[PDB]
Swiss-Prot record:
The keyword Ribonucleoprotein does not apply. GO terms for molecular function: DNA binding. It comes from Babesia bovis. The keyword Membrane does not apply. Residues 23-93 bind DNA. It comes from the Eukaryota. GO terms for cellular component: nucleus. This is High mobility group protein homolog NHP1. Residues 1-24 are annotated as: Disordered. InterPro entries: HMG_box_dom (IPR009071), HMG_box_dom_sf (IPR036910), HMGB (IPR050342). It is found in: Nucleus. PROSITE patterns: HMG_BOX_2. Pfam families: HMG_box (PF00505). Keywords: DNA-binding, Nucleus.
Length: 97
């Protein structure tokens, strides 16, 4: 929240022009249990909270959901086939909020 009264024009993270700078990683494999709550971030990041296009882009992003360095072996990105069910939840909770 702006209004720090320290600078000449303190900007806020709510500004649309200001990038979200948030994590776009997929739900862990085994940690999926806890990582499943990642969908909650939808609130902390109201910038893309209304990402209606994310639903259509999720397709090509399905492969870019996991880490790149771990996407080479295709061992992680592959196992995502399961967590993918919980991962999609995030983009699902966004369309609403």
């Amino acid at each position: 929240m702006a209004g720090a009264s320290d600078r000449t024009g303190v900007r806020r993270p709510r500004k649309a022009k200001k990038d979200p700078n948030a994590p776009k990683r997929a739900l862990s494999s085994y940690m999926f249990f806890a990582k499943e709550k990642r969908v909650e971030i939808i609130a902390e990041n109201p910038e893309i909270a209304k990402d209606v296009a994310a639903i259509g882009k999720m397709i090509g992003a399905a492969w870019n959901a996991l880490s790149d360095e771990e996407k080479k072996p295709y061992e992680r990105m592959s196992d995502e086939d399961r967590v993918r069910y919980e991962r999609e939840k995030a983009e699902y909770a966004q369309r609403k909020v």
